[PDB]
């Protein structure tokens, strides 16, 4: 039993036939990543059953913009001049590729932050990573290799 | 590497095919290889018990015709269109029958060209073989030249 | 000369080659074939030889034992990113 854990591959060619070309892309990701767990899909199934500061920075163009309204509706803790979301998954993109996050937004007149996971998506692959996790990486690697070097100082 | 690679059949053993297997096995119950999934099912045991271990070691589909039709349907399609347009005379309680005929015409035509690929494929093979046979012939006649130029170059 | 082998013949020949420890090694320490689950899945499919009437065709009995080992190992074997089988990295 071996895990792929801290993001690895895609799901590829299988919704390449179903076709990836933005907007549909997000749903293709859902099958692929094995990472739609609650809200976005839940919204999907219920129907299937029968701005923000970052959003202002983002600005949504086409049908995914319509979905966005739906998602807010699904997940909005409400305060006087503010709304906060539970488990929505969403995206930011360009041309060949994009990046998407699954997040929680806290709002106010002069500031608003979404805490989430962010995932980049190029050519049927997802990236989800952490600095500090990122460092431990080639850092411990550098040192194990330096200690190979130090072990080689077994020279007279 | 005198060590062989694993059998070509390995490519069929994807996790997607494995998932489709249980349903396929069922449907089947309702050498004969027809699709990829057939390879995920052990081959049948031969009749000749000589595979038992001795011990241990520890009608021509006439196309000249199909082209006739094709040529007909085409004129028929053209006339029928000539009428819809008004170039030829026709009473309005037919107008839609013309449209009927065109749809049906264009269909049959499709089925024809459709049934013409085999014969088409062959002309392509016979076109390839011809082509490569001409290439190889050339390759030799090219080697021949060199031997003749070496004779010239040798005699000056 | 004989015609090209049948699938049944190809698989019988192949499962039996696993009776050779060196060869199984040369595979275990391949790269490409462990990237994708295909080969792993193939070897589990090959356990069809372990039962009758199939097994009655096996001349090299060790290959069945080694297949079994090889198989059980794989389930819990951790596959490196390149293809390297993790639990073997120390050995040649």
């Amino acid at each position: 039993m071996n895990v792929t854990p801290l993001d690895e591959l895609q799901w590829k060619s299988p919704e390449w036939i179903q076709v990836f070309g933005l907007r549909t892309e997000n749903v293709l990701d859902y099958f692929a990543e094995s990472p739609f767990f609650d809200k976005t899909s839940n919204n999907q199934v219920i129907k299937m059953q029968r701005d923000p500061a970052r959003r202002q920075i983002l600005f949504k163009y086409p049908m995914y913009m319509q979905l966005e309204e739906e998602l807010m509706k699904l997940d909005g803790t409400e305060y006087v001049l503010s709304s906060v979301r539970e488990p929505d998954f969403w995206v930011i993109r360009k041309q060949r590729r994009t990046n998407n996050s699954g997040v929680g937004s806290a709002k106010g007149p002069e500031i608003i932050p979404l805490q989430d996971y962010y995932i980049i998506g190029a050519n049927i692959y997802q990236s989800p990573t952490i600095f500090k996790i990122v460092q431990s990486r080639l850092m411990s690697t550098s040192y194990h290799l330096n200690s190979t070097l130090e072990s080689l100082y077994d020279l007279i | 590497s005198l060590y062989p690679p694993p059998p070509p059949y390995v490519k069929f053993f994807t996790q997607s095919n494995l998932e489709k297997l249980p349903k396929y096995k069922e449907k089947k119950a309702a050498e004969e290889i027809t699709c990829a999934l057939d390879y995920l099912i052990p081959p049948p045991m031969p009749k000749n018990q000589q595979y038992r271990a001795f011990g241990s070691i520890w009608e021509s589909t006439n196309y000249q015709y199909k082209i006739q039709e094709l040529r007909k349907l085409l004129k028929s399609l053209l006339l029928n269109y000539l009428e819809l347009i008004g170039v030829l005379s026709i009473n309005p309680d037919m107008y839609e029958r013309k449209v009927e005929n065109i749809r049906t015409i264009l269909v049959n035509i499709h089925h024809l060209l459709n049934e013409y690929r085999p014969h088409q494929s062959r002309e392509s093979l016979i076109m390839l073989l011809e082509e490569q046979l001409e290439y190889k012939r050339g390759e030799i006649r090219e080697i021949e030249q060199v031997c003749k130029q070496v004779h010239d170059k040798l005699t000056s | 000369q004989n015609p090209l082998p049948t699938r049944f013949e190809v698989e019988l020949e192949f499962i039996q080659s696993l009776a050779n420890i060196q060869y199984v090694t040369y595979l275990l320490t391949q790269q490409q074939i462990w990237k994708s689950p295909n080969f792993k899945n193939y070897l589990k499919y090959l356990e069809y030889w372990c039962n009758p009437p199939y097994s009655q065709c096996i001349v090299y009995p060790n290959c069945l034992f080694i297949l079994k080992l090889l198989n059980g190992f794989m389930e819990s074997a951790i596959v490196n990113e390149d293809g390297l089988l993790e639990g073997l990295d120390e050995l040649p």
Binding site: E8, L9, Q10, S34 | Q15 | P37, V79, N80, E81
Partner: peptide, 25 residues
Amino acid sequence: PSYSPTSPSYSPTSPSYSPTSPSYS
């Protein structure tokens, strides 16, 4: 001003950091 310029080495031919298991549909 730690040294002067910064020592290139950039590398995609290294051992490897990616695995692979969700290839199957």
